[PDB]
Amino acid sequence: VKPNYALKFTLAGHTKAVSSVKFSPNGEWLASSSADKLIKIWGAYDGKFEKTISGHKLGISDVAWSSDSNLLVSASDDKTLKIWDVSSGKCLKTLKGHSNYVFCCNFNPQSNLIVSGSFDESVRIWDVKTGKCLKTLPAHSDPVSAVHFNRDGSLIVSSSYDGLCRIWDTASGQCLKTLINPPVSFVKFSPNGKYILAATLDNTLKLWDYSKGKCLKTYTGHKNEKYCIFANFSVTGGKWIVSGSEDNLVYIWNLQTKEIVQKLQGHTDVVISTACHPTENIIASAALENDKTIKLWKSDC
Numbered sequence: 001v002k003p004n005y006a007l008k009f010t011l012a013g014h015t016k017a018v019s020s021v022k023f024s025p026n027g028e029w030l031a032s033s034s035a036d037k038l039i040k041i042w043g044a045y046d047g048k049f050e051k052t053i054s055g056h057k058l059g060i061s062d063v064a065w066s067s068d069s070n071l072l073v074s075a076s077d078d079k080t081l082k083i084w085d086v087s088s089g090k091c092l093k094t095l096k097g098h099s100n101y102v103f104c105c106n107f108n109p110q111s112n113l114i115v116s117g118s119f120d121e122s123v124r125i126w127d128v129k130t131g132k133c134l135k136t137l138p139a140h141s142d143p144v145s146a147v148h149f150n151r152d153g154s155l156i157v158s159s160s161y162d163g164l165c166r167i168w169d170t171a172s173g174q175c176l177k178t179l180i181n182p183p184v185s186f187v188k189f190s191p192n193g194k195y196i197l198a199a200t201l202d203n204t205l206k207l208w209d210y211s212k213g214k215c216l217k218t219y220t221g222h223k224n225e226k227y228c229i230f231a232n233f234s235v236t237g238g239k240w241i242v243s244g245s246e247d248n249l250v251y252i253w254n255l256q257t258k259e260i261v262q263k264l265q266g267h268t269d270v271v272i273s274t275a276c277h278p279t280e281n282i283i284a285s286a287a288l289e290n291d292k293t294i295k296l297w298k299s300d301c
Ligand SMILES: O=C(O)c1ccc2c(c1)nnn2C1CCCCC1
Pocket: 190, 191, 192, 193, 194, 195, 207, 216, 217, 239, 255, 256
């Protein structure tokens, strides 16, 4: 059982490296962020360019959607996050408090909170409605590379170049577990909240059992020794792990067997980010400056 992702559209418009692509929860849009200081919105199905959202003073590392698909949050080298109304393109709030680049961001499922991680080694939890910081967690001893809420919002997982992943109780800010030293470049909870997928800068993805603090699966064969490359759980068809790679390919693994099931050829630079559509077997991928495009791919399974 293998997927058959094939290229459907190639999207161009950003003028510097893309950093992150994300499909809206309602499936209608793809958002992209870039070192060019811009967010772009594209039709998720035909790639049609929709709008540019602008206001950050420096490049953007990440963007994330609210559960109702109406809001975006972005994390910027200007040391702020911004909350955006997607329909109007307007900045609703600027979240100030980090003392260096903000690298990662996510809403909780309820979408009343945002979590951020920064070069400043902290994780912050913000109130969406007021735009004020509720908690600053002294989370890591090196830049924070990823932050993600679990399925009900009760926990946050963070990762850092310090080699650690940490699980935090959202309401209290207490660290409930540290997974233990290669730099960790990405982390997220599995859909059921019981596992955690982590990328490290030694060409390795790992699936950890949260309750046991133990690694259950590793996924290798790709190249990842430099860039923050996200990894995804693909769940609409076959159960895969999806990731970009520094050899210009999208890698897709069987989650259970760890075997590579497809390598998507087409980009001409590092595939820095990938995202999986919430209902269709559709992948978005973005590549670095020799390539300059976002590609949309479709599989029958
Ligand atoms: O939906 C999810 O979050 C999810 C999480 C882990 C899953 C899964 C679905 N299907 N199989 N596995 C195994 C991974 C390897 C260890 C035993 C479980």
